[PDB]
């Protein structure tokens, strides 16, 4: 309950490095990458285009391991 996840604040294009303006925090279901990880996600790349409002999941970020 109340676990916030990283949500795409903009459509994030494939193979583009994550910046702070692309990531917001929201309580969504299912749970994705924890919102506390937003700083460590900066400059990592997604391996697929992530539409606006999509929860970022571990498998979408290249190099992400919690």
Curated annotation (Swiss-Prot):
Top-level taxon of origin: Eukaryota
Tissues where this protein is expressed: Detected in blood serum (at protein level).
GO CC terms: extracellular region
Keywords, in A-Z order: Antifreeze protein, Secreted
Family, similarity comment: Belongs to the type-III AFP family.
Name of the featured protein: Type-3 ice-structuring protein HPLC 12
Site keyed Important for ice-binding: positions: 10, 15, 19, 45
Subcellular location: Secreted
Stored InterPro entries: AFP_Neu5c_C, AFP_Neu5c_C_sf, Antifreeze_III
Source lineage: Eukaryota, Metazoa, Chordata, Craniata, Vertebrata
Chain ranges of the AFP-like domain: 5-64
Described function: Contributes to protect fish blood from freezing at subzero sea water temperatures. Lowers the blood freezing point. Binds to nascent ice crystals and prevents further growth.
């Amino acid at each position: 309950a109340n676990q916030a996840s990283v949500v795409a604040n903009q459509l994030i294009p494939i193979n583009t490095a994550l910046t702070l303006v692309m990531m917001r925090s929201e309580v969504v279901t299912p749970v994705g990458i924890p919102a506390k990880d937003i700083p460590r996600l900066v400059s990592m790349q997604v391996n697929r285009a992530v539409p606006l409002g999509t929860t970022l999941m571990p498998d979408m970020v290249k190099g992400y391991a919690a």
